[PDB]
C-alpha cells in the first residue's frame, strides 16, 4: 500500500537562561525508526527499529552532524520569532517542524511535505508544488518574504524529491519483514448489568496492528448510530493497540445485539454477541 517517511522536530526554549532542548523523531510508515535528543547523556541519532542496526558508524555520525546544525537553526529561529511576536525569553516557547515524502504502492513519489508550527499553532507550510509558501499570520509573512528572497523552497524541493525518496526506498527494503507485518484483533464482549435490567454490552478489540479499526453494534442486522460509546484507540505498550465500543439500551434481551470488527489484518471480518 502507500508508504511514507517523516521527521518530526521540536525545539523547546528553556526559561532558566539555558539552551533549548531539541528532539528529532524519524518515522517510516508511521513507525518510529530513529531518534535524536539533545538532553541525552551523549546526544546522537539512535536506531529505534531493529532493521536500523545494520547502518554503519558513518551513517549515525552524519545524522548526528545534521542534528547539531538543526539545533543551531532552531536556536536562531527561536530568537527571531520572539522578536516578531514581542515575547520574553523568560518564558518557554515551542518550535515544531514536520517534513518528509509519501510514496504509492509502486514506491513512486506522491508528494513532498514541509510544515512548521510555533506555540502549537500553524506558522508556515510549503505548498504541494514545493515552490510557494503559505504563511499563517502577519508574523509568518516576514519569514515567507525572507525565504522567497533566499530561494529556500528550492533546497527543500531537492531533498523531498531526491534524498527523501531514495532513502525511504532503502528503508522499505531493509525493513521488509518488520514493515509488512499486521496483528489481527482478538475480540470479545463483556456485559455489565446497569440499573433497571438495562445491561451495557462492550465489544473489545485487542492486540491489533496497525491502529485503524472499525467496531460496530447491530440490532437484528441494523447498525446502531446513536447510543454507541466508542473509546479512542490506545496503545497496549507491546507495539499493539486496543479499542472498545459499548451499547447501553439492551435490557434482558441481549442476543438481538451483534458486534462487528473490521481490520486489514483479519482474514475475514469478525462477528460476536454472548452474555
Amino acid at each position: 500500500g502507500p508508504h511514507s517517511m517523516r521527521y518530526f522536530e521540536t525545539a523547546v526554549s528553556r526559561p532558566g537562561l539555558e539552551e533549548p532542548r531539541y528532539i528529532s523523531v524519524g518515522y517510516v510508515d508511521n513507525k518510529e525508526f530513529v531518534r535524536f535528543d539533545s538532553d541525552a547523556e551523549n546526544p546522537r541519532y539512535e536506531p529505534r527499529a531493529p532493521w536500523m542496526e545494520q547502518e554503519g558508524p558513518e551513517y549515525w555520525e552524519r545524522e548526528t552532524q545534521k542534528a547539531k546544525g538543526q539545533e543551531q537553526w532552531f536556536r536562531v529561529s527561536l530568537r527571531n520569532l520572539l522578536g516578531y511576536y514581542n515575547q520574553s525569553a523568560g518564558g518557554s516557547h515551542t518550535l515544531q517542524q514536520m517534513s518528509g515524502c509519501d510514496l504509492g504502492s509502486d514506491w513512486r513519489l506522491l508528494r513532498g511535505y514541509l510544515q512548521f508550527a510555533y506555540e502549537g499553532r500553524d506558522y508556515i507550510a510549503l505548498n504541494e508544488d514545493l515552490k510557494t509558501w503559505t504563511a499563517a499570520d502577519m508574523a509568518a509573512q516576514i519569514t515567507r518574504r525572507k525565504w522567497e528572497q533566499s530561494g529556500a523552497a528550492e533546497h527543500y524541493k531537492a531533498y523531498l524529491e531526491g534524498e527523501c525518496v531514495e532513502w525511504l526506498h532503502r528503508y522499505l527494503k531493509n525493513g521488509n519483514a518488520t514493515l509488512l507485518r499486521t496483528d489481527s484483533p482478538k475480540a470479545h464482549v463483556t456485559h455489565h448489568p446497569r440499573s433497571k435490567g438495562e445491561v451495557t454490552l462492550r465489544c473489545w478489540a485487542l492486540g491489533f496492528y496497525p491502529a485503524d479499526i472499525t467496531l460496530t453494534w447491530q440490532l437484528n442486522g441494523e447498525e446502531l448510530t446513536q447510543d454507541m460509546e466508542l473509546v479512542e484507540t490506545r496503545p497496549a505498550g507491546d507495539g499493539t493497540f486496543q479499542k472498545w465500543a459499548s451499547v447501553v439500551v439492551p435490557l434482558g434481551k441481549e442476543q438481538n445485539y451483534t458486534c462487528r470488527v473490521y481490520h486489514e489484518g483479519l482474514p475475514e471480518p469478525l462477528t460476536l454477541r454472548w452474555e
Binding site: 521527521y7 528529532s24 524519524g26 551513517y59 552524519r62 545524522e63 545534521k66 542534528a67 546544525g69 538543526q70 537553526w73 536562531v76 529561529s77 527571531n80 520569532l81 518550535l95 517542524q97 517534513s99 512548521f116 506558522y123 508556515i124 519569514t143 525572507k146 525565504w147 533566499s150 529556500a152 533546497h155 527543500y156 531533498y159 534524498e163 527523501c164 532513502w167
Partner: peptide, 9 residues
C-alpha cells in the same frame, strides 16, 4: 536520512 534546513525563520 534527515535534512539540514536553509534560511532561518
Amino acid at each position: 536520512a534527515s535534512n539540514e534546513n536553509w534560511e532561518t525563520m
